[PDB]
Each structure stands twice: as structure tokens, then as C-alpha cells.
Design a protein around this ligand. Structure first.
Ligand SMILES: *[C@@H]1O[C@H](CO[C@@H]2O[C@@H](C)[C@@H](O)[C@@H](O)[C@@H]2O)[C@@H](O[C@@H]2O[C@H](CO)[C@@H](O)[C@H](O)[C@H]2NC(C)=O)[C@H](O)[C@H]1NC(C)=O
Ligand SMILES: *[C@@H]1O[C@H](CO[C@@H]2O[C@@H](C)[C@@H](O)[C@@H](O)[C@@H]2O)[C@@H](O)[C@H](O)[C@H]1NC(C)=O
Ligand SMILES: *[C@@H]1O[C@H](CO[C@@H]2O[C@@H](C)[C@@H](O)[C@@H](O)[C@@H]2O)[C@@H](O)[C@H](O)[C@H]1NC(C)=O
Ligand code: IA4
Ligand code: SIA
Ligand code: NAG
Ligand code: NAG
Ligand code: NAG
Length: 526
């Protein structure tokens, strides 16, 4: 199977999925490799080729530091890259139904990873099941991460910032120009992503250069207003200059600093990335999105508040235990290999780990609001409070606030609370419904019965896949055939949301109301 694109012919490959066929095009380039003098610059358009490009294997993943905290442990290593790292990584993937559809809705995945890690080739992002089951086209792209994707000397085109977001954008542009050749509908494109990918999707809603490149948006466990998602111009410059000092590249002319960093091996860049901040946390985003005056024309909180974003439907949600995964990356007393019953003193020390630049009063105010116990004698009280602190502050309250503010300008929004812990989850049970572990359900891995998920998880994934596909196709995440709970729109008054679990799917109101009033109204003042 050969498809003529606007830059040349590409060859795909046939997959057998659930007794049917999916055509996969893996590793289509969508930009000039950003190498040599193109490192740190915006992605450049692609010169045509005359041969047949063989898109039959996942391409290189972008340079990035690896999670080496639990060698040999699938719970962490399933997120590490599974193809060679290379600066030559600006490639994308396309899964199309077989037989070739006529005007199929398109789903574009943007992976997360704190804007420092990630790759589209991960097993849990395999789009062949979505294409097979729902006859949508799935596209995913690699984009630059870390300093190579987000280094910023604001205003300087040698390193303007937001390059990895512009990589994402050029890929959406590729889908606009080429996807009809694959049987896709460029007028029916839904972006979806998780964590930093979700924050990325939310910034595409704010960026005027992305408004004509997609229809709708899905935001899984993330949004730009999360406290880790946007770097200020002060810190971005301080971090670029710290990286220059760490590499021997300090110069007076800012452009000569970039030229010096262009001659450094990617490994020297990657090795010094962690130290550009003084106080890291397990959630540090050393190099990430900034207000560059190009992709982002103003501080995104201002754009959100004043209604300056794409008017369309959104689907947004969070997981029950967003915060727990980060506790075993530094909080004292915590371990994935025991039950992590921590004391009050260990709790207080954990706040210092997760809020290092925050005043004593600010840390006490966290302790005061989260340690008013239903039972003082419950031994896991402090262990659970710290997970909820990290989860509510970093993910759940920003997602709820994004959805509130977004829906106030008249658009339909749908909010979910994912509370199913995967039966295959390799992390311990005290970490619950972890950050990142709805993705496999969204992508339909539990539909593969050979893979030891329960039957109840097959059913849950099947229903989630249908709702996601109906949202992309029709702007409405219902499952209309199997007497399913109707998913109501989220309004800023009543704030209804839908719970996703294997027992009973429920309509609830005002998620984490007391906790989020603390984080959204009081804590930003400290
Ligand atoms: C749970 O484990 C943590 C982590 O300790 C490590 O992992 C264990 C599973 C075991 O292999 C230990 O030998 C390892 O050191 C424990 O936290 C440590 O506690 C000791 C004494 O309390 C202290 O000296 C260390 O600094 C702690 N490690 C930290 C803070 O990272 C914790 O006590 C264990 N909790 C339970 C309930 O078993
Ligand atoms: C591109 O691929 C052509 C055909 O490859 C066919 O499919 C792959 C997956 C292998 O199974 C191969 O044995 C098949 O014949 C090649 O003929 C051609 O040389 C390739 N082009 C380049 C530039 O590598
Ligand atoms: C800004 O930068 C100052 C210098 O940072 C120091 O040197 C670099 C190379 C790193 O190793 C870093 O860890 C060092 O602390 C800092 O002193 C300062 O705190 C930074 N931040 C702010 C807000 O000023
Ligand atoms: C050390 N961890 C760095 C990643 C990171 C840095 N900064 C962020 C900001 C938001 C979300 C994630 C990050 C990796 C955390 C992952 C989380 C996914 C589930 C279990 C595996 C462990
Ligand atoms: C150090 C270590 O590997 N410990 C134990 C692991 C992990 O604690 C969990 O899988 C969560 O990471 O779990 C086991 O009990 C299990 O699941 O059979 C085996 C093993 O003794
Ligand atoms: C695909 O659908 C759009 C409307 O969503 C329509 O304008 C376009 O002509 C269609 N293309 C086909 C059917 O090839
Ligand atoms: C910095 O170097 C660049 C590269 O030649 C040059 O164009 C620019 O004018 C220099 N800036 C200053 C202030 O000298
Ligand atoms: C609806 O129910 C049938 C069984 O009656 C099941 O096979 C099918 O997968 C369900 N569809 C969805 C979209 O959940």
C-alpha cells in the first residue's frame, strides 16, 4: 500500500487486529531534521523526496533523559523510550482503517512526560485498536522535549522557546495538507493528550496559529494552568544562562551563547538540564513552554480568563490518585515496595520536597487544610494526604479551573473522574488510580483478550473508546446503544461530572470543591 503525499510517496504496512486489518504508516517525516545550525530553532518545512519513503517502523525518539529510578521495573520503564534517541526525531505515525475510509474523523495524540521526556512509539499509544474498532484515523508525532525543545532566549530566533510546541503544530499542519490522501477528514480533527500532552493540547486552544488546524480537544490529566506547565520569562532566561555556565558557553552576546550550545553533544546538554534550577522537585519542568510572543502572545492565564481561545467543545478529566506516583521519587518514608505509612514529621518533610520555594506559612497552610482527620488514629492518614496534596495542586484543581473558565464562554465541556485501577498495574496498591493509567483504556488495550485484563476492563475500555470516538466525531461523548449513563455537560454553576469505573458509572457534582477552593483561591496568594 502506497500513498502519495504532498512531499512524496510513502509505503505503509498491514496489521492484523481483531480478525480485521489496519494500515500503519510509522515514521513519516514532517520537518527537516533539526540538526547542526537548526538545533534550538523552529522546525523547518520539508523538501520533497522522489523515492518511496518506507514508513514501516517507528522512528527515532527525541533526545531525553531516561527514568533510571527503578531499573528493571515495568512500572517506570514502560514510559522510557523504545526507539533510539536522536536529534533527528521529527516524525509522525498514521493508523488508518482497512479498507481505506472515505471521510474518517482524525484523532491526534500528543504524549506527555513533563515536557522533558516521551515518545509516540510507546506500546500504550498504539493507535491500531482505535482505528480498527472505531474506524477513525489516529495520528501521533514525536516533538522535541527538554532544552532541545524549549530552551528560551525570548525574542531571539536562534532559541525563541516553544520549539517542541511548534513541532506539534507543524505536524497538525501536515495532517491538514495530507490526511485526505489517507481517507481522513481534515475538517474533523480532534487533538487528545495526557499530562504535558494535555497541557500542550490546551495551549493549542490558545495559540492563534493552531486554531484552523483542529476541531475539538480532549485533555487527560493536564492543562496549561497547572503549576508545572508554563515557565515565566524570568526563569526561562535564568535557566538558559545557567545551562550556558554549566557547559562553558557563557558569552556576552546572547547569540554567541546559542552558537556555543550548538557545538555541544546532546549528551552534554541532557546531563546539565537537571541543575539549571536551584531546588528541584519530582515535578520539575526545567525547560518547558514560555510566553514567546509567537505561539503564546500573552500570559495564558490572561487569555483564559478573558476568553481569548478557540470556541469549540472540550473533554477533560483526571484520575483519582494523580499525586501518588511522584511520592516515591523523593518524599521521605515512601517506597513502591512497602505500604509507605509515614508520620506527621515525614509529611512535613514531604511538603518541603514538593514546595521548596514556598514560605513556612504556605507549607503550614497546606498541612492545616489537609490534616483535619476523620480519624486521627488511621495510620495511612498522612500517606494519603500527601498524595492528595500533590494530585489536587498539580493536576485536579487546575483541570477543574480550566474547565470552569473555558465553559463560561459558552462552549460545551464534559468532565470525567477516572477511578479504575488497572488489574495489571505493576505499582503497589497504595498508589491507587495512578497518573497515566487511563491511557491504556483510552487506546483500547483491554480489548485484546489475549492480554490478561478482566472482562469488566474489556467492557470499560470498549465504552471509553466509544465515548472518545463519538466526542471526536460528533462533539458528544455518549455511548448511545447500551443503556449507558448519559454524560451531562459541565457548567460552571452545577459542575456535573461523570465517573468512569467498572462497577457503576455515576453523575456527581463539584469534584474536590473544598480542596480546590484552597488551591485556587488561597494558595496563589502565599
Ligand atoms: C519503606 O521503605 C522506605 C525506603 O527504605 C528503602 O526501601 C525499603 C523497602 C528497604 O529496602 C530499606 O532498606 C531501604 O532503605 C523506608 O524509609 C527509610 O527508613 C529508614 C529508617 O526509617 C531511613 O533510614 C531511610 O532514610 C528511609 N528512606 C527514605 C526516607 O527514603 C520506610 O521506613 C519503609 N516504611 C515501611 C512502613 O516499611
Ligand atoms: C523500501 O521497501 C521496499 C520493499 O520492502 C518490502 O517490505 C519490507 C517491510 C521488507 O519486508 C522487504 O523485504 C519487502 O520487499 C524495498 O524494495 C526498498 O528497497 C525499500 N527502500 C529503501 C530506501 O529501503
Ligand atoms: C538564578 O540563577 C542563579 C545562579 O544559579 C547557580 O548556578 C547555576 C549554574 C546552577 O548550578 C544553579 O543550581 C545555581 O544555584 C541562582 O543563584 C538563582 O537562585 C537562580 N534563580 C533565581 C530565582 O534567581
Ligand atoms: C520522575 N518523573 C518525571 C516526570 C515529570 C517531570 N515533570 C513533570 C510534570 C508533570 C508530570 C510529570 C512530570 C516521572 C514520573 C512518572 C509519572 C507517570 C506514572 C508513573 C511513572 C513515573
Ligand atoms: C522489591 C520488590 O520487587 N518487591 C515486591 C514487588 C513490588 O513491591 C510490587 O510489584 C510493587 O512495585 O511485588 C511482589 O510482592 C509481587 O507483586 O509479587 C514481589 C516483590 O517481593
Ligand atoms: C468530508 O466532509 C466535509 C464536511 O465535514 C465535506 O465538506 C467534504 O467535502 C467531505 N469530503 C469527502 C466526502 O470526500
Ligand atoms: C552577536 O553575534 C551575531 C552573529 O554574528 C551578530 O549578528 C550580532 O550582531 C552580535 N551581537 C552583538 C551585540 O554584537
Ligand atoms: C454493547 O453491548 C454489546 C453486548 O450486548 C457489546 O458486545 C458491545 O461491545 C457494547 N458496545 C459498546 C460501545 O460498549
Amino acid at each position: 500500500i502506497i500513498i502519495a503525499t504532498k512531499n512524496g510517496k510513502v509505503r505503509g504496512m498491514q496489521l492484523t487486529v481483531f480478525g480485521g486489518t489496519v494500515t500503519a504508516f510509522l515514521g513519516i517525516p514532517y520537518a527537516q531534521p533539526p540538526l547542526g545550525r537548526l538545533r534550538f530553532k523552529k522546525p523547518q518545512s520539508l523538501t520533497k523526496w522522489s523515492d518511496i519513503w518506507n514508513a514501516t517502523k517507528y522512528a527515532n525518539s527525541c533526545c531525553q533523559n531516561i527514568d533510571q529510578s527503578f531499573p528493571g521495573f515495568h512500572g517506570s520503564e514502560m514510559w522510557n523510550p523504545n526507539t533510539d534517541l536522536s536529534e533527528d526525531c521529527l516524525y509522525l505515525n498514521v493508523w488508518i482503517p482497512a479498507p481505506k475510509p472515505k471521510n474518517a474523523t482524525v484523532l491526534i495524540w500528543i504524549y506527555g512526560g513533563g515536557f522533558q521526556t516521551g515518545t509516540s512509539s510507546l506500546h500504550v499509544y498504539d493507535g491500531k485498536f482505535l482505528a480498527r474498532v472505531e474506524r477513525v484515523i489516529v495520528v501521533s508525532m514525536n516533538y522535541r522535549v527538554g532544552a532541545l525543545g524549549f530552551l528560551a532566549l525570548p525574542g531571539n530566533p536562534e532559541a525563541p522557546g516553544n520549539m517542541g510546541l511548534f513541532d506539534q503544530q507543524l505536524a497538525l499542519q501536515w495532517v491538514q495538507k495530507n490526511i485526505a490522501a489517507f481517507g481522513g477528514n481534515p475538517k474533523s480533527v480532534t487533538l487528545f493528550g495526557e499530562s504535558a500532552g494535555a497541557a500542550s493540547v490546551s495551549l493549542h486552544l490558545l495559540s492563534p496559529g493552531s486554531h484552523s488546524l483542529f476541531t475539538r480537544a480532549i485533555l487527560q490529566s493536564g492543562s496549561f494552568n497547572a503549576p508545572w506547565a508554563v515557565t515565566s520569562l524570568y526563569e526561562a532566561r535564568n535557566r538558559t544562562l545557567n545551562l550556558a555556565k554549566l557547559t562553558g558557553c557563557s558569552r556576552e552576546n546572547e547569540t554567541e551563547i546559542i552558537k556555543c550550545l550548538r557545538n555541544k553533544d546532546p549528551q552534554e546538554i541532557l546531563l546539565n538540564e537537571a541543575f539549571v534550577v536551584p531546588y528541584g522537585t519530582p515535578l520539575s519542568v526545567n525547560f518547558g513552554p514560555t510566553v514567546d510572543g509567537d505561539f503564546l502572545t500573552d500570559m495564558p492565564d490572561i487569555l483564559l480568563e478573558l476568553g481569548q481561545f478557540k470556541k469549540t467543545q472540550i473533554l477533560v478529566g483526571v484520575n483519582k490518585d494523580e499525586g501518588t506516583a511522584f511520592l516515591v521519587y523523593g518524599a521521605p518514608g515512601f517506597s513502591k515496595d512497602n505500604n509507605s505509612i509515614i508520620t506527621r514529621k515525614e509529611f512535613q518533610e514531604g511538603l518541603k520536597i514538593f514546595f521548596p520555594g514556598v514560605s513556612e506559612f504556605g507549607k503550614e497552610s497546606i498541612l492545616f487544610h489537609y490534616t483535619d482527620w476523620v480519624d486521627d488514629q488511621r495510620p495511612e492518614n498522612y500517606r494519603e494526604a500527601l498524595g492528595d496534596v500533590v494530585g489536587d495542586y498539580n493536576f485536579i484543581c487546575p483541570a477543574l479551573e480550566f474547565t470552569k473558565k473555558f465553559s463560561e464562554w459558552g462552549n460545551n465541556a464534559f468532565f470525567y473522574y477516572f477511578e479504575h485501577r488497572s488489574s495489571k498495574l505493576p505499582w503497589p496498591e497504595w498508589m491507587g488510580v495512578m497518573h497515566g493509567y487511563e491511557i491504556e483504556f483510552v487506546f483500547g488495550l483491554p480489548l485484546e483478550r489475549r492480554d490478561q485484563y478482566t472482562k469488566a476492563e474489556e467492557i470499560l475500555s470498549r465504552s471509553i473508546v466509544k465515548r472518545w470516538a463519538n466526542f471526536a466525531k460528533y462533539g458528544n461523548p455518549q455511548e448511545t446503544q447500551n443503556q449507558s449513563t448519559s454524560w451531562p455537560v459541565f457548567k460552571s454553576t452545577e459542575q456535573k461530572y461523570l465517573t468512569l469505573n467498572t462497577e457503576s458509572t455515576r453523575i456527581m457534582t463539584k469534584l474536590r470543591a473544598q480542596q480546590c477552593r484552597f488551591w485556587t483561591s488561597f494558595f496563589p496568594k502565599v
